[PDB]
Amino acid sequence: HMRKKLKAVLFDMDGVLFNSMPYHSEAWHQVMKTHGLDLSREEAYMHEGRTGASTINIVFQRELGKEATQEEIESIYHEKSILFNSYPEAERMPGAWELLQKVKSEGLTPMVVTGSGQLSLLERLEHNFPGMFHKELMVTAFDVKYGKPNPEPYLMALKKGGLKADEAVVIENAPLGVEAGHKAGIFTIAVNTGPLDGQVLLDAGADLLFPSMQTLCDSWDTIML
């Protein structure tokens, strides 16, 4: 009984609302390559959701056999941010406006759930999707102690929305994000908007898997039945 119970649609930001992940992946890949370290474009997608500190540390441990210092982390994250900002501004993901408009027309409330503290993108949510979201019904890095894959961001969204888990659905693109939605006990739809094998998203706990936001939008009515 999904139509009867659903009140809210909890959208992830990077790779769901904004097509930002090719740029995050490229910046991570390239910053590491300039330092002689191997972080593939695909692997950068696997780590989507982790702090910059954790990603850097995973690479340092695997390739250099030690942890990074705080000054190594701060420098590399700064350089990553420089590269990302040098690329074009991330456009809306195709299909994201259409699905937002559709769920809104069905009387559902869109929410954003992200572990991001990236103000350049956070501020653009209002600019790029006017009337879709409300800051009281958003979860960002500023709201949470632990990000994805911990369920905290999604449980916080349920709390901010005054919702029970069965009154929400999560839309996620990343395996750590899917894990967070699933561990929050919420029906989680994976949208495989990157280069990863869809099996990684199923293994993370996805209830349904679609290859793109537009394909999800096209199939939304048949989910609701």
Binding-site sequence positions for Ca(2+): 12, 14, 48, 167, 173, 195
Look at residue 192 and give the partner it binds from Mg ion, Cl ion, none, a contact being a CB closer than 5 to 8 Å depending on partner kind. Answer: Mg ion
109, 116, 173, 188: residue in contact with Mg ion (rule CB under 5 A): 173
46, 192, 204, 210: residue in contact with Mg ion (rule CB under 5 A): 192
What residues pair up with 18 in beta bridges, in sequence order? 14, 92
Annotated binding site for (R)-malate: 12, 114-115, 148
Q: 131: burial class by Cβ within 10 Å (0-12, 13-18, 19+)?
A: exposed
41, 92, 102, 104: residue in contact with Cl ion (rule CB under 5 A): 41
Residue 4, φ and ψ in degrees, nearest 5: -65, -45
In angstroms, the Cα distances linking 104 to 7, 45, 127 are 10, 29, 18
The SS3 assignment for 197 reads coil
40, 81, 101, 214: residue in contact with Cl ion (rule CB under 5 A): 40
Residue 55 lies near Mg ion (rule: CB under 5 A): no
User: Shortest Cβ distance from residue 39 to Cl ion (Å)?
Assistant: 8
Sign of the alpha-carbon dihedral angle for 61, 24, 116, 15: negative
Q: Which residues 6+ apart lie within 8 Å of 117 measured at CB?
A: 140, 141, 142
Judged by CB under 5 A, the stretch of 67-75, 105-113, 178-186, 187-195 that binds Mg ion is 187-195
- Residues at the site binding Mg ion, with contacts judged by CB under 5 A: 12, 14-15, 173-174, 192, 211
